[PDB]
Amino acid sequence: GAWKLQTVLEKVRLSRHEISEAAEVVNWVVEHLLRRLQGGESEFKGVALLRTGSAPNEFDVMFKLEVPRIQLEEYCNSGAHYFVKFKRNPGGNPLEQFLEKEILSASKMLSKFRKIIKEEIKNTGVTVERKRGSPAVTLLISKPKEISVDIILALESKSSWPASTQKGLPISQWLGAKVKNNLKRQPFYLVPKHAKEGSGFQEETWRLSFSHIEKDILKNHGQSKTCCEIDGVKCCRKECLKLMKYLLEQLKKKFGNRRELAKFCSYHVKTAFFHVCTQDPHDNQWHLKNLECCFDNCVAYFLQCLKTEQLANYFIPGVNLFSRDLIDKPSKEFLSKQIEYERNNGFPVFW
Numbered sequence: 256g257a258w259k260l261q262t263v264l265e266k267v268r269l270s271r272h273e274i275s276e277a278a279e280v281v282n283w284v285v286e287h288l289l290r291r292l293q294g295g296e297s298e299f300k301g302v303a304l305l306r307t308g309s310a311p312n313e314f315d316v317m318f319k320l321e322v323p324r325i326q327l328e329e330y331c332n333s334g335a336h337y338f339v340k341f342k343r344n345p346g347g348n349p350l351e352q353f354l355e356k357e358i359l360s361a362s363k364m365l366s367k368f369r370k371i372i373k374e375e376i377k378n379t380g381v382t383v384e385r386k387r388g389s390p391a392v393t394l395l396i397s398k399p400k401e402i403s404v405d406i407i408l409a410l411e412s413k414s415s416w417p418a419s420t421q422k423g424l425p426i427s428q429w430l431g432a433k434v435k436n437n438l439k440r441q442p443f444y445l446v447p448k449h450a451k452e453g454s455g456f457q458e459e460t461w462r463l464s465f466s467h468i469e470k471d472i473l474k475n476h477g478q479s480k481t482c483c484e485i486d487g488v489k490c491c492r493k494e495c496l497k498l499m500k501y502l503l504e505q506l507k508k509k510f511g512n513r514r515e516l517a518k519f520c521s522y523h524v525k526t527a528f529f530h531v532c533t534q535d536p537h538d539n540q541w542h543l544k545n546l547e548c549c550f551d552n553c554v555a556y557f558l559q560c561l562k563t564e565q566l567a568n569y570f571i572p573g574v575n576l577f578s579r580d581l582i583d584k585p586s587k588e589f590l591s592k593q594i595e596y597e598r599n600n601g602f603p604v605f606w
């Protein structure tokens with residue numbers, strides 16, 4: 256009880272109320288816009304909502320677009336980025352006007368996407384800011400409350416997951432082979448996300464997105480089916496993830512005046528957390544009463560990731576989120592030093 260983590264969890268929860276009401280607002284706007292696209296005659300007719308995914312004035316949502324016969328070409332042997340292409344369909348491809356020869360232009364598609372949402376924003380109390388660099392068409396909600404909502408276009412493919420994901424999702428000892436097999440039968444998504452710097456080639460690439468698998472695993476996170484249910488026993492997995500996210504955000508805000516923490520995000524700790532679930536697959540390794548030791552274990556694993564510059568994408572093992580290509584050594588050293596300090600002093604940044 257020395258770290259008083261339950262009190263920290265209460266602090267984090269208290270905040271859940273305001274964002275709960277912003278939902279009504281986002282729900283209202285977004286669902287309308289969807290109806291609009293679906294009823295119009297644009298290439299985004301087949302658009303639908305994806306429920307996947309703190310700071311209460313900022314949300315993002317994903318509009319998926321089924322597209323069949325998707326073929327993927329790996330971009331520069333990177334397991335995450337891909338060119339999307341199509342062979343000739345005798346019928347029309349609704350995205351045919353975005354192709355240059357066989358391959359899909361993310362830029363021309365996003366440009367068009369942004370264009371027609373702008374035309375459909377016609378009442379109001381809501382606008383869309385000029386392009387942040389980000390793929391998202393971001394909405395600015397004036398009233399009732401002030402809300403930023405980023406709309407992320409995604410392609411949905413119902414084909415088998417790409418080869419790069421072959422050794423990914425190492426959950427066989429934890430959630431089991433049947434769950435793993437069923438998750439991998441689910442569709443995957445492609446999102447036009449590329450680095451700020453980058454060639455025009457990169458700007459036309461798409462990266463794999465498994466946010467829906469992540470959500471499923473977090474919500475169904477126990478080896479026992481009764482984990483955290485009333486007729487079961489409570490684990491601390493979700494509490495550890497929340498605390499890890501909270502530690503990073505409190506640190507990013509404490510040191511927002513320097514560059515070293517700018518490239519770290521919640522996805523890094525979530526990724527590290529999933530690896531810890533794989534190392535410790537049994538519910539009895541996560542008893543709620545041992546919250547402190549479990550949190551400490553997650554923190555130590557994350558420190559080992561920083562030091563060794565190794566944090567493999569959970570779904571795409573060939574992708575190292577902590578490679579020196581992506582985050583320089585001094586940045587990881589800085590975060591390492593702060594996390595060691597926090598850990599040695601019972602996490603003062605929580606208070």
Ligand SMILES: [Zn+2]
Binds near residue numbers: 491
């Ligand atoms: Zn549980």
